[PDB]
Write a protein that binds this ligand. Structure first.
Ligand code: TPP
Ligand code: TPP
Ligand code: CA
Ligand code: CA
Lengths: 807, 415
């Protein structure tokens, strides 16, 4: 549960002191100096003579354009924090402005506190400049390596979804969220503005959007800087914001005036925020118009206005570096020298190379500092969830009537379970879902909380299970749902979201970035404590999108997640819920886990339950398992074939194939896979099955029929170095399907029980069985023709029950 | 190419100092004295025992009516150039206001630096008063013999075309273009207004039109003075100007109160021009509304109200000389004596007859001075053109096919 830090939502009531503003100007000037330094200088940080091109980096890596803008804002936010004692986390949309984030951390004292090698003296200042975007050094973005960051801003557009996740169930948290005007052109950013109808000003914190309207992205102007100011204002008002606009640096107005104007404006907005928060103590059912700030300043603010006759300040040319080289010529190095001198470092640094005390006297102390605030390292806040007994959700009926029982909808059991997680962990757990929580069958959670909704109510006949405050949130944007949950985890809370499988792909790129964040964190950032896993229920999956058709039939998220399964990072979970009981086992493991993206593939369709809780726990701990009770073979030598399934439906088709093989008197072994990564080469993954364990399950010499939920390519590439790999005959989804019957879905993809049975015969003795094979292919066409003619499936397919079930 | 002189388009960000305004009143008073001096006195500049008809020019040559208005404006502009370090050239549209122009050059020091016979003292002062519109002296208009003049305003109409032509490719140059209200009735001037469509606030400099709405030309009211103020303002806004208006001298308002209001308005107009110029560094495709100043003052301002029962201040009757002779009678000579004493020259000149240090202290220095600005002497800026090799363009086919060949358009070769 988020901590109450500082003295939240306090008005100042006095003007901002001239003293504190002189601080901010110094912060600004020194942060700009540190920022140019990190880009340009390998040595001689303070320009002690002789200062020459030998001091300048060979390759210029880093972004200036965004950075002076960031430095001004952060300077002013640091003043704000100190004077008000406000719990504040910043979201740096333009994450390519990493020099501003490292500067902030250097100057607030979290950098030295975290990297003691980087000292508050000339020598520390020198390693500090060299390390930036430099071999064996630090990233060029506001990376997880930087104290203060929960958002890299590498991949643009998640600034607002991250900002609004952070404040959820975080009533003391202020989040000034800085958004690139280029970033604002992305789809994820454009929908993120609407988050203000999904948060409550009493129970959640406050996000102040700051649009960094610097006029440009890389090689273009931005749309929002070149529409009318009037359009820009209606735009933000229409999305439920009170827009304030600040314009500085397009004229000769001196720095002190700029700082005085800004500080008055900032305090006027803050006053408005303190009134929103004070009102919300009495009235949290009326949605307020939340302030947002349009920060219009020239890109590259304070760089040379022109370089080699090209406009540089207030241009896209300042995007990366305004001065392409400071080595090629003396005239160029001279521009660097002048530029660095214009911040007057002689005033900012004492002879020992430390920043003077009067630069940083206005700065916050302790856990209020941007870099030290525990919300920016949410691991330190994160508690274990109080979990209910998994026993109470177990489908007991498998133990009663045998493996293969029933027509249960597995995701309902995950719903009962998550419901009680929310009940027992209020303010600490959230379900997100893109208008799919009921569709994926997770609505049992509506018994103990509601869908959070802070737009209009109209009627009890339609507005069911909705309140201004609640642990479930739903918007039709996978981006928003991935986004909110990511930031809710980064600030030390927990959750699950669900998606139709096909549409997980919408946020493939966001899985990549959070995976990279997690990969970087577990390799080389041990100060950044572990966060709860991004748990993702993948359901309404390909084999039962027979009702929605081809658009909804893509299980390929499996393939994407496999490209983040390296270096024994163990940040990817890929689980196949065989049934309700396997789903509970996976669920508990995932909800206990940390530093992972967990993807749980589970059906919502009525389906058999195969395992007891115990059998599922067992299969899950190793990842795969022989099903002895299902196997006509007694050991691997007797076995003529290995029937292996991954996914609840493949399991179903394999078990049914197994009953037809059973009647022809074939000896076969049945294998279930629940953990895809258990099959990964034991060379690449220390948690996979050993080649010995693998060979014991898949036999080493017998052919294996593998029925796989997703695309067969996934397995053929996982097991390339595995014992017996060349005897694996892998069936998976094959881009066949439409709106049809469950049976046609498996049939047309050659993973139906009939084809599986036939395939198993072909692989034992083709000629010996030529006629039972030919009988099976004929029936395959007859059952299809039965569906075409009757509009439901042949009763052979429909009415089948595993032989192992008794009345 | 044009030199960047001084510190262009700087806001003061401070109220105009009282000392400077006292300077401007002293400029205004001395310049009015030096102006009436140039017109009326052959000898005895500073009126010492005996000052009589003996010391007065026989033929009265010069224009007074426009002059005190110009002296007011130029005093205020001089205060402006010093305070701001602004590269400034004026266009004296009412060229007949020549005394305002010479007076200016005498006081900014460029007259003595250029014509060193005309010293800064009683002897110089006597010479200077005598030579005005005098045989073997200088002209009655703001002629090229006058430092600071790129524009004579003898043939009225070219005040705005000259002002806008001067600012092209001259981004640092500011041009107060003082247009007469009679002049503003001429074709050339009427379309000269529209030149704010053919200049760019980033690559060209800035023209400030000052309409000298002093109510009259020679023998008539001016159109622009006798239309409703609401019309006058719409006219100017239609032509892409923000019109500001200043009215003074119609009531008893003490002169220092007028200087304070005028200076406050001038710097408001200047803040806006500075805003236009700052914006252009960023957006120079959207045409702004350029300030213009409507300066409404009585014609002949500070001359005697009435003379021989006829209204003279606030009248056409003052266009040339309000007092038609200071010799014909002794009553007339006492009018010129009282008129010259009204500026209190006993406060403006020291013993030698030099203008006092406190009168000129506010004034600008060096190349910023109206009379010493290189733009006012284009020649000192002019370089030879880097011409291309003339062979490259020659119609060569005449040598090969002989004399009289072809059907060429000759201008294209000049093109
Ligand atoms: C999703 C995505 N697409 C493309 C890019 C490439 N990119 C990185 S920076 C940038 C421009 C950013 O412009 P803006 O947000 O306006 O930033 P600033 O001006 O503050 O530097 C682009 C196109 C990206 N980082 N992320
Ligand atoms: C084209 C042209 N026509 C006529 C004249 C003669 N003239 C000189 S001064 C004058 C009146 C000018 O009035 P205005 O411009 O109002 O000047 P001010 O009132 O300042 O004396 C006239 C008609 C002239 N100089 N140029
Ligand atoms: Ca931008
Ligand atoms: Ca007139």
């Amino acid at each position: 549960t988020s901590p109450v830090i500082g003295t939240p939502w306090k008005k100042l009531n006095a003007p901002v002191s001239e003293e504190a503003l002189e601080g901010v100007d110094k912060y600004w000037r020194v942060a700009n100096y540190l920022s140019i330094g990190q880009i340009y200088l390998r040595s001689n940080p303070l320009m002690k003579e002789p200062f020459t091109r030998e001091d300048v980096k060979h390759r210029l890596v880093g972004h200036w354009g965004t950075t002076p803008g960031l430095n001004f804002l952060i300077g002013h936010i640091n003043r704000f924090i100190a004077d008000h004692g406000q719990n504040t986390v910043i979201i740096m949309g333009p994450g390519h402005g990493g020099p501003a984030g490292t500067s902030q951390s250097y100057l607030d004292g979290t950098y030295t506190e975290t990297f003691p090698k980087i000292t508050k003296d000339e020598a520390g200042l020198q390693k500090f400049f060299r390390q930036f975007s430099y071999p064996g050094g630090i990233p060029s973005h506001f990376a997880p390596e930087t104290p203060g960051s929960i958002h890299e801003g590498g991949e643009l557009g998640y600034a607002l979804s991250h900002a609004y996740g952070a404040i959820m169930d975080n009533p003391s948290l202020f989040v000034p969220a800085i958004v690139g005007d280029g970033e604002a052109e992305t789809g994820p950013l454009a929908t993120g503005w609407q988050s203000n109808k999904l948060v409550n000003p009493r129970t959640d914190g406050i996000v102040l959007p700051i649009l960094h309207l610097n006029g440009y992205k890389i090689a273009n102007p931005t749309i929002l800087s070149r529409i009318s100011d009037e359009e820009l204002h209606e735009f933000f008002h229409g999305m439920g914001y009170e827009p304030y606009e600040f314009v500085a640096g397009f004229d000769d107005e001196d720095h002190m005036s700029i700082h005085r104007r800004f500080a008055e404006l900032w305090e006027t907005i803050w006053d408005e925020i303190c009134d929103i928060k004070a009102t919300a103590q009495t009235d949290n059912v009326h949605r307020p118009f939340y302030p947002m700030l349009i920060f219009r300043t020239p890109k590259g603010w304070t760089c040379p206005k022109y370089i080699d006759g090209k406009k540089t300040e207030g241009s896209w040319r300042s995007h990366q570096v305004p001065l392409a080289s400071a080595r090629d010529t003396e005239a160029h190095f001279e521009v660097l020298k002048n530029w660095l001198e214009s911040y007057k470092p002689e005033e900012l640094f004492d002879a020992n190379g430390a920043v003077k005390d009067d630069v940083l006297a206005f700065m916050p102390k302790g856990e209020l500092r941007i870099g030290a605030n525990p919300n920016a390292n949410g691991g330190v806040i994160r508690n274990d969830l109080k979990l209910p007994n998994l026993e109470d959700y177990e489908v007991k009926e498998v133990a009663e009537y045998g493996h293969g029982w029933g027509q249960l909808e597995a995701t309902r059991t995950l719903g009962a379970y998550t419901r009680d997680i929310i009940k027992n962990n209020p303010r600490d757990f959230r379900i997100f879902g893109p208008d799919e929580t009921a569709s994926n069958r997770l609505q049992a959670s509506y018994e103990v909380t509601n869908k959070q909704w802070d737009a209009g109510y109209i009627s009890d006949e339609v507005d069911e299970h909705m309140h201004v405050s609640g642990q479930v949130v739903e918007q039709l944007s996978e981006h928003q749902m991935e986004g909110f949950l990511e930031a809710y985890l980064l600030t030390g809370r927990h959750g699950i979201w669900s998606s139709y499988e096909s549409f997980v792909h919408v946020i493939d790129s966001m899985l990549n970035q959070h995976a990279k964040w997690l990969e970087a964190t577990v390799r080389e950032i041990p100060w950044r404590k572990p966060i709860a896993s991004m748990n993702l229920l993948v359901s309404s999956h390909v084999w039962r999108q027979d009702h929605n058709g081809f658009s909804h039939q893509d299980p390929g998220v499996t393939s994407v997640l496999l490209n983040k399964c390296f270096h024994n990072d163990h940040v990817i979970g890929i689980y196949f819920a065989t049934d309700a009981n396997m789903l509970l086992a996976i669920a508990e493991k995932c909800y206990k886990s940390t530093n992972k993206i967990n993807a749980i593939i589970a059906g919502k369709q009525p389906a058999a339950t195969w395992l007891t809780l115990d059998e599922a726990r067992a299969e899950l701990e190793k990842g795969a398992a022989a099903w002895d009770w299902a196997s006509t073979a007694k050991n691997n030598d007797e076995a003529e074939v290995v029937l292996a399934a991954a996914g609840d439906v493949p399991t179903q088709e394999i078990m049914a194939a197994s009953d037809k093989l059973k009647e022809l008197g074939v000896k076969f072994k049945v294998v279930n896979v629940a953990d895809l990564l258990s099959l990964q080469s034991a060379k690449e993954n220390d948690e996979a099955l050993t080649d010995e364990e693998f060979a014991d399950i898949f036999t080493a010499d017998k052919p294996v029929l593998f029925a796989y939920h997703s695309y067969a390519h996934d397995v053929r590439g996982l097991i390339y170095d595995r014992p017996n790999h060349d005897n694996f005959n892998v069936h998976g989804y094959e881009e066949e399907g439409s709106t049809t019957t469950p049976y046609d879905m498996v049939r047309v993809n050659r993973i139906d029980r009939y084809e599986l049975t036939a395939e198993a015969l072909r692989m034992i003795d083709a000629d010996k069985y030529a006629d039972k094979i030919d009988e099976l292919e004929k029936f395959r066409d007859e059952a299809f023709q039965f569906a075409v003619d009757n509009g439901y499936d042949h009763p052979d397919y429909t009415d089948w029950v595993y032989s192992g079930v008794n009345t």
